[PDB]
Amino acid sequence: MFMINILSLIIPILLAVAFLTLVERKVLGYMQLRKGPNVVGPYGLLQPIADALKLFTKEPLRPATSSISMFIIAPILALSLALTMWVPLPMPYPLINMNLGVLFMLAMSSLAVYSILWSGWASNSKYALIGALRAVAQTISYEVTLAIILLSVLLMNGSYTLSTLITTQEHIWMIFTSWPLAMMWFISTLAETNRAPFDLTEGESELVSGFNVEYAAGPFAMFFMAEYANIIMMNAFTAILFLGASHDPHTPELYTINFVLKTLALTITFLWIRASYPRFRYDQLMHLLWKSFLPLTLALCMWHISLPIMTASIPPQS
């Protein structure tokens, strides 16, 4: 039955990614006085299927200068980790219940970076190398702030167990307790997924296509799916951490729905930001994350360490 659970957590996520592509296109269109995909299927509902079939029926090209092994391993690592980072998510019950699921998520994200690195390096192109170096610089800028903010907001949780987040927020969303950390975490998640004002690894208007410039057909589809799956997963993480939802143990559907709606709202805000701001310069991205967030993240880490002790509100260990 566990294999059935694995399939019921992977296939629906891939379908959600496929339709999130269409949702993003239509949202951008309607925010640009346009109409998203509207011909292929009713209201464009068949566009993702057409895109997938085109990509997987498209000839994939293997660059002559490319290192084949890494060039093929990178896409696999990207998708596998994108699908794996959903394993510990509590909705309301996690598939795999870890005492340290949060650190597992951090480690899985840190590994996913190497997909962009190796894809860029192995592509053996100047634009791909620039994209890989930009990914390196991006992960240099956000990782420390990401971990510090996550630690500070989990100091009121009592452990790194993700399921406990539901209990901690049983009377109040944790965003009412750490909204500056919430803002900084949201921006860090934007930077991490190579997303709005931080689309520097891909850089459509500056690097043609970034690290995936030499990728076509299937592998390109896998990188896109991994990117959007990471988007949805990170938005789900933001939902569980700050926007807690009521969980009736006898009717888990209530939580599931509330959770899904919050994640959808966060993804829609991701697209909203994508169609509202110009792109950063990765020098400015690193300067922001190192000189405006990091000092403030350290200060708020001090504050959230001292607060439970000074208010006698240390959360339970178990």
Binding site: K291, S292, A299, M302, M310, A312
Partner: protein, 82 residues
Amino acid sequence: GRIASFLKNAWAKEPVLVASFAIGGLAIILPSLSPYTNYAIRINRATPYNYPVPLRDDGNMPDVPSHPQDPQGPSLEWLKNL
């Protein structure tokens, strides 16, 4: 005089650092100037992580509570009203 000019200039050019030093400064000073830090300590001691191993009764332990729930011994009534 000079402090007011410095702080006004600091919050006009680099407002991010002004907040961080203020928040960081409070996190060091406030815990000492609090009456609930001792309560936080007592709560941690109160939680019985390990078994309360009993001691052999020699007959000369007046305050040690040889009982299920008789009055002698420590009380958590303070935590109940916290």
